[PDB]
Ligand binder design. Sequence first.
Ligand SMILES: CCCCCCCCCCCCCCCCCC(=O)OC[C@H](CO[C@@H]1O[C@H](CO[C@H]2O[C@H](CO)[C@H](O)[C@H](O)[C@H]2O)[C@H](O)[C@H](O)[C@H]1O)OC(=O)CCCCCCCCCCCCCCCCC
Ligand SMILES: CCCCCCCCCCCCCCCCCC(=O)OC[C@H](CO[C@@H]1O[C@H](CO[C@H]2O[C@H](CO)[C@H](O)[C@H](O)[C@H]2O)[C@H](O)[C@H](O)[C@H]1O)OC(=O)CCCCCCCCCCCCCCCCC
Ligand SMILES: CCCCCCCCCCCCCCCC(=O)OC[C@H](CO[C@@H]1O[C@H](CS(=O)(=O)O)[C@@H](O)[C@H](O)[C@H]1O)OC(=O)CCCCCCCCCCCCCCC
Ligand SMILES: CCCCCCCCCCCCCCCC(=O)OC[C@H](COP(=O)(O)OC[C@@H](O)CO)OC(=O)CCCCCCCCCCCCCCC
Ligand SMILES: CC1=C(/C=C/C(C)=C/C=C/C(C)=C/C=C/C=C(C)/C=C/C=C(C)/C=C/C2=C(C)CCCC2(C)C)C(C)(C)CCC1
Ligand code: SF4
Ligand code: SF4
Ligand code: SF4
Lengths: 189, 200, 148, 110, 365, 55, 73
Amino acid sequence: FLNQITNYAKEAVQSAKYIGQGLSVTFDHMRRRPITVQYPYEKLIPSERFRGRIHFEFDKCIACEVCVRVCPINLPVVDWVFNKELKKKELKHYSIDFGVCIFCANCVEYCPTNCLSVTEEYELATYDRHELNYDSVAMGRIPYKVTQDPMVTPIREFAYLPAGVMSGHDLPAGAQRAGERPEAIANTA
Amino acid sequence: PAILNPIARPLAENIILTSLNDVYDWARLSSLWPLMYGTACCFIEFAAMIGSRFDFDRFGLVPRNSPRQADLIITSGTITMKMAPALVRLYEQMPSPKYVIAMGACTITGGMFSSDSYSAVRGVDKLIPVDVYLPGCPPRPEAIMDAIVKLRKKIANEHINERGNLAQTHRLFTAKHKMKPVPPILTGQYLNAPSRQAPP
Amino acid sequence: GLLAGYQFVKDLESAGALALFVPPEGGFEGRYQRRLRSKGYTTLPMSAPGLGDLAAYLTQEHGIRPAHTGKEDIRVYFQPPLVTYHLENLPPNAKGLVLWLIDGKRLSKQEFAYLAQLTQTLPKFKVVVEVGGDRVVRWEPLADWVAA
Amino acid sequence: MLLKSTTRHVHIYAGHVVDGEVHPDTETLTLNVDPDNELEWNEAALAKVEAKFRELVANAAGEDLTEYNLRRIGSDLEHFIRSLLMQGEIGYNLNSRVRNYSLGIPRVNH
Amino acid sequence: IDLQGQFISALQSLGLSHDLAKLLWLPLPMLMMLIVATVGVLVAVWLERKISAAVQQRIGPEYIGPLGILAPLADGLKLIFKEDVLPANSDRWLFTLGPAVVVIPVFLSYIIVPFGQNLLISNLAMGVFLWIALSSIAPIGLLMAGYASNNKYSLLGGLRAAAQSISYEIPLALAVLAVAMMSNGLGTVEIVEQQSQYGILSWNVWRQPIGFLVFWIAALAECERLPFDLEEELVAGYQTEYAGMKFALFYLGAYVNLVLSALLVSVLYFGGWSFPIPLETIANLLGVSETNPFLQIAFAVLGITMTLIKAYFFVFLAILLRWTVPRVRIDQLLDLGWKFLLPVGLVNLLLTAGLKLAFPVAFGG
Amino acid sequence: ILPGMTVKVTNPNDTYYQFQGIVQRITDGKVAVLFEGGNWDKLVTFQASELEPVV
Amino acid sequence: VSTELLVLGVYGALAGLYLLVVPAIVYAYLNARWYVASSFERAFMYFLVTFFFPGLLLLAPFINFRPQPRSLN
Ligand SMILES: CCCCCCCCCCCCCCCCCC(=O)OC[C@H](CO[C@@H]1O[C@H](CO[C@H]2O[C@H](CO)[C@H](O)[C@H](O)[C@H]2O)[C@H](O)[C@H](O)[C@H]1O)OC(=O)CCCCCCCCCCCCCCCCC
Ligand SMILES: CCCCCCCCCCCCCCCCCC(=O)OC[C@H](CO[C@@H]1O[C@H](CO[C@H]2O[C@H](CO)[C@H](O)[C@H](O)[C@H]2O)[C@H](O)[C@H](O)[C@H]1O)OC(=O)CCCCCCCCCCCCCCCCC
Ligand SMILES: CCCCCCCCCCCCCCCC(=O)OC[C@H](CO[C@@H]1O[C@H](CS(=O)(=O)O)[C@@H](O)[C@H](O)[C@H]1O)OC(=O)CCCCCCCCCCCCCCC
Ligand SMILES: CCCCCCCCCCCCCCCC(=O)OC[C@H](COP(=O)(O)OC[C@@H](O)CO)OC(=O)CCCCCCCCCCCCCCC
Ligand SMILES: CC1=C(/C=C/C(C)=C/C=C/C(C)=C/C=C/C=C(C)/C=C/C=C(C)/C=C/C2=C(C)CCCC2(C)C)C(C)(C)CCC1
Ligand code: SF4
Ligand code: SF4
Ligand code: SF4
């Protein structure tokens, strides 16, 4: 009967030591700096693979209706007419809804004359949904650069740090893309 | 008539009342208690903001599971019509100064389930009045913070003299029907069923 | 805090177009937008990135193409000018209208002079454009921002 | 079991409002039209909506009380509301806190 | 110095009847202690939020003021503006006055805690009775609000929270009894005087080490720090039925109980208004300290500072141990309470009586 | 510069270091640069002093 | 001149030091370091915020804490 009492005392002192170790690691966790970012004061750097808005050009277009069949919902419409003076068709209007858009960038890939483009815009907040049918002259505007804005602070993500950084907040050097670009390898080696 | 769906047509203030209205709007701008409602990966995108990487808490928004102490609901995910009266009751059980932020492409419109679908609700604006829409499938958490910023820009537009709009009129009507009584639906009765242990 | 008086209304009635610098962390233009309604102006929220062309949407009528899924045919919706139809059945007291653009960062400087001439052609509606701002609330003339 | 189906404008409750609450009763269907400040109304179009509701509840006879038939009745009521809006009748009001065109946008006939 | 005697002499020199002049003197400190209690509550809410942010490596509420210190004030100013909603039931006055019955005695028990020899309200005989018997009322208001809640789950959660709250009253009284036996008194003034006679060597934390831990565990179980009773059998225990006003009242009442417990634990065991070096040696080293108030004002400020750093240390330790120790069930909590704090408290009282009857030299005699 | 020529970005502060792009249009002293990486065509704008012409 | 006037002057100087000159240097030092401070120094900073809180309630809406803009070439 006494062995159960000694086992209970051993479990109690082990639980007290576990509580003390939890207090020790909690006091250890107060030493490190916070690793969060501020908005809209410290905006993240968009990578070359991160997609966004779809930009449309009205000059390098032939109205061939190829990317409409690639889209599962067929959101870009082609308002093409037939002209009797020429032998081809011309585009009149170009509209696309963005509230039902998946943003997967599949119509941009199947394009030989690169008529669609990827634009680094994600800040889209509107009080009404009826204005989402964007016009071609509205999609032909200049994107907002995060570098040229003097009020924001540029900070890269985890995979854009030189030689391996676990925090990625100070960045005292100007190096990026840890590795080597494939241009100096042909010069030296 | 030549115009479809027409719109019907619908002053000195004090400085102390203006300052009291600024204080009353600043309190709602500072507290902004949200509600966490999510049925899909948009709930995971919302929970990624609660973690210590984006710090969604720093604007004043604290996570609450109660649909009674939240002046803002955040609907998120693909909404089934079986969940539509649930969302209607969760919106109606909230207090009167409430706001709606709809996050997602399948929430604000039909999304991807707008071509061949018979169960997904094509738009949450048919259910609850959306104040700030948020396109994206899925949207960036910085875009959710931008929607929070636009909601904060929209809250300060309210007035203390034009406060007589947060109510519902009666417009009651009473009529009779001739429907047949239905048998009840199953409530439990899964394990200790007479057709389960005894094979027919 | 800062007990703001009635000074944005006089600067809006003197000029034709103004540009205010707000902090983008929260909301502070709502106080002036509420003071405009207290003075007797009808506010109209509108987003500056999605507008198409300013002339065909503000003076004349346009044609919107809804996104069809192949189920319906190609249809066109005749949209009237927004500020004209908002000015038609407007007035309870007939004082004035304002137009507020939320995100005025994604715009070019070519249509700004046309908007500043359009708000001076018809003396019934104003133009308010928002810039991302630098640490303080300040107002500037939009024509001086175009010329400089 | 409280059978109901509401989206934004129609409220078909299978009970009876005594003072401020409802009780389960399969003999009375209460109709509430446009509880939120989204459309301005009158007394003639609301009477036409009530007459269409009486015609729709007189059409559905000899059927079981389920959610599907009540939701179909509410959908026919909202379709009647949308066709009444498209007919050249009352529409939106510029007095609410939020302005979202859920039924349609004002367009030009010609 | 005596501000009350000088005010009485000034009102007598003005010309009064010595009764209505002395009647209205008490409401000014009676409201001053209330407003500094609300100041301490607004301190503790921001402190808990920022320390919970600093534990999990993030920043608390910002963009509301200089560093977000107005956010508890903004929350308390917003939650009184919300629409008071009521469920579909009867007894609306009972549902209103339930949280009032909860909020009255915990706020009422502010006449017990001292801040010095003269900086206190009431020290008649038995302030520990006026703490315990007034803190043991809130289960009645909890059960009243649970009955007026009209729910199947919230009533069961209120019953579970009341059964959790009433069980930790008996070791909370026995740990008070173990100190009141040694101090031969029930008032806090004699208890703090027996500790402030000497310096560190007269503290009750080194004389009764088991009773301090029992009292701390009972306080953490009573103020609902480790028991999460606010996932409570469907969603929450006594929640999801009120509005912003009643939830704000419950939140401020919980923070008042936390502040009052963090003050009372230090007062009964460690001792506010105390110094490691005795004040008589410093008064003999400086000069003559019997009528000169230039050092006495600084000594009173130092005693208030010692009480405030002890209260801040206990608050920080409680809200640090909230997220340190994991969550245990309420059945395991009641089992560990009734199987640990009562028998070791009884044998601690027995060994306290034995040590007092054996050598009555260093104890209270 | 003219729209339709190949340029190169040489700014050591930005992430895109020595990337060949295609000029789309010129307005307000800003140059739209179309990059060709993988199977997706991204368009990141720059300034007039940031780019250098490469034949 | 008397001793009660000296006591009133000491009370006024103590109220002025409690309300004006301490939260200014607290607001300076608190965001001056804010990262290099250890856990004990963080507890000291949180105590400095805790103690002089009637000064912070009067100096809160007047001061401004926002980052400065940078220059671009
Ligand atoms: C993390 C948690 C954080 C917590 C929060 C921390 C931040 C907030 C910290 C703030 C400090 C906390 C509050 C301090 C402790 C409470 C002190 C108090 O309540 O203390 C209560 C005090 C009263 O306490 C003491 O009261 C004494 C009277 O005691 C008598 O009465 C007492 C009962 O009140 C006791 O019974 C005592 O035994 C008995 O002797 C005297 O008045 C002393 O002077 C006084 O110090 O109230 C007063 O201070 C008097 C009330 C103001 C009256 C104004 C004075 C009247 C004006 C006089 C002007 C004279 C003008 C003429 C001048 C002549 C010109 C020639
Ligand atoms: C725009 C809005 C403007 C608002 C205007 C409002 C202005 C008026 C409010 C300002 C208050 C702040 C100014 C500080 C005054 C502190 C005076 C003080 O402590 O006065 C001391 C006197 C001393 O009291 C006398 O003290 C005597 C000596 O005893 C003292 O000494 C003895 C030594 O053994 C014992 O220890 C005893 O317990 C201890 O009290 C006796 O106790 C007498 O009974 C008693 O009358 O207290 C008293 O009368 C009671 C005084 C109550 C003050 C409590 C406030 C809390 C103190 C501020 C917090 C400290 C901050 C200091 C910051 C400094 C940082 C470096
Ligand atoms: C002759 C002097 C007179 C002085 C009068 C002092 C009055 C103090 C209270 C101010 C009251 C008016 C505030 C107006 C609100 C506003 O629009 O935002 C003003 C600022 C905006 O930020 C702030 O704004 C400033 C400018 S800006 O807006 O950022 O651009 C910026 O400088 C600053 O950094 C930033 O904090 O918001 C605040 O942080 C101020 C909070 C003031 C709230 C006080 C609470 C009142 C408690 C008592 C309530 C009693 C009623 C109880 C009811 C039951
Ligand atoms: C300077 C002052 C420092 C004071 C700090 C003390 C406050 C800590 C109190 C703990 C609150 C949480 C209680 C939860 C405890 C918990 O949840 O687990 C309690 C745990 C229960 O274990 P089981 O569930 O296995 O036990 C019941 C089963 O065995 C059923 O058969 O064991 C205990 O009963 C032993 C209790 C020892 C508790 C020791 C607490 C003190 C540890 C720290 C000692 C510090 C010494 C400091 C020296 C400088
Ligand atoms: C003279 C004077 C003054 C000063 C002050 C001071 C000097 C103070 C300080 C002090 C302090 C500053 C204090 C504080 C503290 C706190 C803390 C610090 C706490 C925490 C901790 C904890 C709770 C932990 C726990 C634990 C245990 C128990 C076990 C082991 C582990 C550990 C340790 C973790 C002033 C200016 C005000 C004015 C008046 C006069
Ligand atoms: S964008 Fe490309 S796929 Fe689409 S019509 Fe133009 S050329 Fe054809
Ligand atoms: S990204 Fe996908 S959904 Fe969007 S337009 Fe292109 S193909 Fe359609
Ligand atoms: S919008 Fe995309 S991410 Fe959100 S619920 Fe729909 S499928 Fe999921």
